[PDB]
RNA sequence: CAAUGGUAGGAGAGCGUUCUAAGGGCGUUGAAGCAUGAUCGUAAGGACAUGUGGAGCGCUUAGAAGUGAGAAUGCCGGUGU
RNA sequence: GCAGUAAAUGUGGAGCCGUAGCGAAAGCGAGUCUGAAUAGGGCGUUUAGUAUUUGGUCGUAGACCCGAAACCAGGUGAUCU
RNA sequence: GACGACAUUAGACGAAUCAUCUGGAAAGAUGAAUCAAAGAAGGUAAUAAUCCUGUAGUCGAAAAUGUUGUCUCUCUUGAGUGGAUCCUGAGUACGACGGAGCACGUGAAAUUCCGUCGGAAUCUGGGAGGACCAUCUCCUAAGGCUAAAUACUCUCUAGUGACCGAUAGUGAACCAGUACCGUGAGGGAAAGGUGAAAAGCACCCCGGAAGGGGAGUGAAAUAGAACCUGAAACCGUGUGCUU
């Protein structure tokens, strides 16, 4: 049947213009007292995922 | 070409591969899956995404974001594809559609600038960005925004 | 272009004009070779069908204790290794056909025509005014025309009498001038069109 | 064990937990054994504290 | 002029079995099977002759698959020690 | 869907994908987001796509075959004990 | 009830071929014809459009049915305008508690149902528009009936299949849910093919018989009833070369 799509990943990565998936940061949620203000703006970001982890998700965001 | 001497276009088709019949096709024993573990097994593998029990890379990442369940997103044309139309004729949305130009005409039409009119033509859509204002007057012409 | 109209007893009459976009094109035998495929898959009617282990009469008991006698361990007496078990990956009902583009589709019809009209096959006969179902004056018609043993009889819009006289004739096959299919003109090896037809097929695919 | 003027009867449903763990229960009606006026004759029937509430006559 | 051991494995070219479409053929002046033979191709395999056999079957091109067995203490049937 | 022979095929333009992207979004647009910034950086902008189909994979299906210890529902049985 | 109309549960008619060759027999081969609204198909001593049953086409019911045109027949009020009053579905809506249902896991949780307690308005009214309200828009609950498009095939009728050909295809082509097994629920097989025609071997010989060997039937009897073809494992009898 339709092949369906992990619908907790669709929340969490925008589809960009070369194919590529642009992902939130981690480390982002509390504990900010043990994190540096350097890591804390570099952190309000976001990256791409990296194309070891798009070979194994390539499927569970075809419809994105 | 004669039904008795047809031939296929060169390439075009392929015979498949069948799996598990002798050692000389190079997939024999055991079909090309390898010795043992899940992979080795029917219905075997391994769900997608997952990491043998390692946190998965989607739980990790967090959420953001929500969706506007209402957005005017307009099907959009271009400068230069205005220059399909003609000299001091009027471009609408329905002509946009007519000429073909626009299919779904989504929550309406929007006049993004990017090339040239070699022309000199009133238009009439539904909005504009500056760009493509300022180009649809240099060479005269209005834009009643409907 | 221009190709002679006959009578049906073969004596020249006027002249018509075909275009050669529609009777003059090359041929691409990659898309005729596609459209001939299709429909011969088309035809197909997929009512196979066999039995697995689970459609397979009774068989649900464990035919003796798994360890302890010495023979090998078996599940049920309708497994696939079993004389009198369920097949494994057979035969489904299903279908076999498929699709191609439009254009694609009417490529094909022209360049069956085309080809046809290359090998000098293609018949233009004025009309045909058979008045009666009579087989031997169809053959006669025919062997007057000089056609070969197969040939394909193309009518204006349906003609019951030239249909019921053709029936027979082992080798003909009588076709309105929308019913055209590929399959039916590359078998063929000679055509016969009535003019009036000629202008339909002109105008429809082209 | 129907209530003889409504029909108010029991159902089932679930017996959940804090957990949210289910165990299936059933739901029963307030039905009362009085006497009534049926068929002309009384007779003694079930029925449920809220066709008592207002309306029968005992 | 250089290269050619090879297992898990990737790639390519192919040989065969049944059926279908078309074309062209063979068949009681003996088909398919079966048996024998000292024959042909690089291989999967292909012919030819002679016997038994008493009616169907090849070849070319292309399509589809219940397509290839030596092992599963495999299943069924025969026959051994 | 309708017509047609359980064919081709004809018709049917709801839809779908592409011609624009960026942003959580409002929005803006060959840019946009962040930012006080006209700075820097992220993602974009140099048109090529789309329909059907052969082949390779993957998902959902029992999904290469065989094989448990076992679980649950409805029935049969105190002629042995 | 009373008249018709096609269709369906028997059926009827239905074109056109002869000769030679090989053969046990031709439908084959060869030559010369013919019909076709019929060259679908199955038979026939081999492979048949013209031999047979049929096919295209046409025709056809005493009756007993579905079906349908009508004729009856049986039923029977259609509007506007005011609008002062009146009426418009109660233990109901709805709320609380517990549950269930909504794609929606109690959640901001609409919309909706069940059990348990409460419990309304009557147009100057009531419900809905996903907490929600105010305003707007739509609707008018708590009584009832309703064909079509839609799902399925134990059957029956006609037909189709790049579906299977006897370890396959039904478990079952064959007196099969039967041998058989079980106390019982239940489980559950194996087994088609002589030839064209039975022409199924008159008599004789050995033998008690089973068998056999002649003769005869037949194209063929290593086609003789366990009967078409008859592989391999396996068992024998000879021997050329070896030990």
């Given at each position: 049947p339709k092949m369906k799509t992990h619908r907790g990943a669709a929340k969490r990565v925008k589809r960009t213009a070369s194919g590529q998936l642009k992902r939130s940061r981690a480390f982002?949620?509390?504990?900010?007292?043990?994190?540096?203000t350097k890591q804390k703006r570099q952190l309000r970001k976001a990256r791409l995922v990296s194309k070891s982890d798009m070979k194994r998700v390539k499927q569970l965001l075809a419809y994105k | 070409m004669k039904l008795h001497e047809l031939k296929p276009a060169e390439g075009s088709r392929k015979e498949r591969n069948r799996v598990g019949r002798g050692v000389a096709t190079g997939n024999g024993k055991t079909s090309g899956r390898g010795?043992?573990?899940?992979?080795?097994?029917?219905?075997?593998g391994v769900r997608?995404?997952?990491?043998?029990?390692?946190?998965?890379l989607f739980r990790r990442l967090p959420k953001r974001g929500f969706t506007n369940i209402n957005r005017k997103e307009y099907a959009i044309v271009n400068l230069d594809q205005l220059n399909k139309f003609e000299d001091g004729t009027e471009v609408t949305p329905a002509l946009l559609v007519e000429s073909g130009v626009?299919?779904?005409?989504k929550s309406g039409i929007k006049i993004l600038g990017n090339?040239?009119?070699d022309k000199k033509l009133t238009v009439k859509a539904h909005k504009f960005s500056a760009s493509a204002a300022e180009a649809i007057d240099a060479k005269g012409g209005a834009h009643e925004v409907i | 272009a221009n190709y002679d109209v006959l009578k049906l007893d073969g004596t020249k009459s006027g002249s018509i004009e075909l275009s050669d976009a529609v009777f003059g094109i090359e041929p691409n035998n990659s898309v005729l070779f596609e459209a001939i495929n299709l429909q011969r898959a088309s035809?197909?009617?997929?009512?196979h069908a066999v039995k697995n282990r689970s459609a397979?009469?009774?068989?649900?008991?464990?035919?003796?204790?798994?360890?302890?006698?010495?023979?090998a361990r078996q599940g049920?007496?309708?497994?696939?290794?079993?004389?009198?078990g369920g097949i494994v990956f057979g035969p489904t009902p299903r279908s076999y056909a498929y699709k191609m583009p439009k254009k694609m589709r009417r490529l094909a019809l022209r360049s069956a025509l085309s080809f046809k009209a290359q090998e000098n096959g293609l018949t233009v006969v004025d009309?045909?005014?058979?008045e009666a179902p009579k087989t031997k004056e169809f053959k006669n018609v025919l062997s007057t025309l000089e056609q070969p043993k197969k040939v394909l009889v193309v009518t204006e819009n349906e003609d019951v009498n030239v249909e019921l006289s053709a029936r027979?004739?082992?080798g003909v096959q009588v076709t309105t001038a929308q019913g055209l299919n590929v399959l039916d003109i590359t078998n063929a090896d000679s055509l016969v069109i009535t003019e009036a037809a000629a202008k339909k097929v002109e105008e429809v695919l082209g | 064990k129907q209530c003889f003027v409504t029909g108010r009867k029991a159902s089932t449903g679930n017996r959940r937990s804090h957990a949210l763990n289910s165990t299936k229960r059933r739901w029963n009606a307030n039905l009362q054994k009085v006497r009534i006026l049926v068929d002309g004759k009384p007779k003694k029937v079930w029925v449920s504290a809220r066709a008592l509430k207002s309306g029968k006559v005992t």
């Open positions: 982002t949620s509390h504990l900010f007292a043990n994190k540096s | 010795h043992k573990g899940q992979k080795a097994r029917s219905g075997g997608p995404g997952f990491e043998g029990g390692q946190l998965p626009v299919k779904n005409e090339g040239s009119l | 035809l197909r009617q997929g009512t397979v009469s009774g068989g649900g008991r464990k035919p003796w204790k798994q360890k302890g006698t010495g023979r049920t007496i309708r497994a696939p290794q079993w004389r009198g009309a045909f005014n058979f027979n004739i082992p | -």
